[PDB]
Design a protein around this ligand. Sequence first.
Ligand SMILES: [Zn+2]
Ligand SMILES: [Zn+2]
Ligand SMILES: [Zn+2]
Ligand SMILES: [Zn+2]
Lengths: 329, 329
Amino acid sequence: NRGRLLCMLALTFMFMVLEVVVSRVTSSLAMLSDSFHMLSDVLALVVALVAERFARRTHATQKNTFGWIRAEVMGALVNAIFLTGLCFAILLEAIERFIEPHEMQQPLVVLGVGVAGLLVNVLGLCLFGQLNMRGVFLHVLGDALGSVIVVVNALVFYFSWKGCSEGDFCVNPCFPDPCKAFVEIINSTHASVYEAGPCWVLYLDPTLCVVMVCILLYTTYPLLKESALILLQTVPKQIDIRNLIKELRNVEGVEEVHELHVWQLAGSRIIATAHIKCEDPTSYMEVAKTIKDVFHNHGIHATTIQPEFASVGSKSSVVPCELACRTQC
Amino acid sequence: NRGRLLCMLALTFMFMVLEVVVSRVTSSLAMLSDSFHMLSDVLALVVALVAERFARRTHATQKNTFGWIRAEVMGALVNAIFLTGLCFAILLEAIERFIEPHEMQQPLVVLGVGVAGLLVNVLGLCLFGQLNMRGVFLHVLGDALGSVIVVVNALVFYFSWKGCSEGDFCVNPCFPDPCKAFVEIINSTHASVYEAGPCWVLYLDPTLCVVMVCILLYTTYPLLKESALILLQTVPKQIDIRNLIKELRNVEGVEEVHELHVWQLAGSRIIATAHIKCEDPTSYMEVAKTIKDVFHNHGIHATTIQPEFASVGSKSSVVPCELACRTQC
Ligand SMILES: [Zn+2]
Ligand SMILES: [Zn+2]
Ligand SMILES: [Zn+2]
Ligand SMILES: [Zn+2]
């Protein structure tokens, strides 16, 4: 449905506006750098929306004689790439939180907007073309787990951390404090009291991002396998070629079955070609009806069985099919 | 060739090792954060390498009755998505250099490694399956233009900027200096001399990244159009369906031409189906030879022309094709 992706696109725009509003109210330019990062969650909805007005034009057009009945199972692919590509990004970025750990300065406000985002994505998840559903549901599960990360982080971050207490002049041993250490080592004045807070919670986030990454990259892969397999002309999973060939040769009136191509258009519109070699060119229609039946019994319905009638003395050359070109094909 | 992508993969690993070596020698943990960003240039070579040992298995296997002759024109797609996706990343990140501009502390060393990277990518470009070539050449042109950015930046950055001079205690008006302003406003001591350098060169980089992004996103798109078009079963650009149908109906012996599917397997292996409606079921082979000729004259060589022989009184129903199923197909 277009209604669902439309509603969810509207919701994410709402939340980005709320985020810019908080980032400007609090006057914290370090938080306005997520209202530009949700433009990566609006893209996976715009794409699966564009591929909704294209799986309905299922009519033979001079520019595609099957129609765009496939632009569904391509949309999913693009999504399941973007996400996975994007997913590695998180992983890469998680490494930076092990080398130069930053500090979540204002934890009440981050808990606030994180719980708002977690609720809007719980709705975007409870809201949910059979592979666009999957290619977008995974993409909202991603940011939902990201929001659970943000809450469980900024939850035990006001509960535990201590940070610099006496104004702006204290020693932060847990990481290479840029101004505190600079001014404190360039001026030795025996200043006021200090403190030191736990560090077992300074790296309680990148571990959560690594877990979210290993969750998405396993929930996504089977979707990506199925999409690329459909798009590589591969026999579906439910049709065994050797059985089709044994059954075509069992039929009366035929003796050989040349090029036998089977594939999958989209969903369950499976096609099938075959040359064939009848013997008597007058009882052909009964043979073709029988062959269409032995295709219909195997979930394969749109066929094309060209019969190659044998001439005089030419039953010694398969490559010509009795009907061929010259060399290339 | 596998040799070219192998050589280039070896070169990029060499350069990443050189980058970690400099980042550890100089003791500048702000530069080790590019030896993790070149793991995004090794991916587009690993993919177009995996799709090299898969466009050579062009043999009918029970798991694909065309073979993987298409896994070339899919590889390109994945590349031309990754890059474009990745390209938006740059653009997004360029915006951060307009809001909170950072400082290239050590410009001689950055010029050094930037010129080394620019030379290794000039080689990776001069080094260069007809769409993998394009899907990887664009991907090296990307980082080559990135390197030109790094050189022209860190070139007129030692030539112009001034920065803080008298030890570690000066005023930096051009941007919200974190330690200088903090310690200078928390302690009013009438300290030593200061200075102020130009700001027309502090934002001489993100403009270069925006130009590199608008260069890649126009050099990539036509590749992505062609790849997705091949993968959506679309008639090629060189075969006009109306002409094929007019020419099949002009041929003797036939009167109607049912489902006429034409598409593109990969490169130039174009297939074509067609039912057809002959009249006299004894002169069929001549008609089929003529039809194969009027397909061969149009760059379309792998055909399948099923003839539907008319029964008694049934020349009033196209939907049955004289040969059909029941309702669904
Ligand atoms: Zn999102
Ligand atoms: Zn993170
Ligand atoms: Zn690169
Ligand atoms: Zn940049």
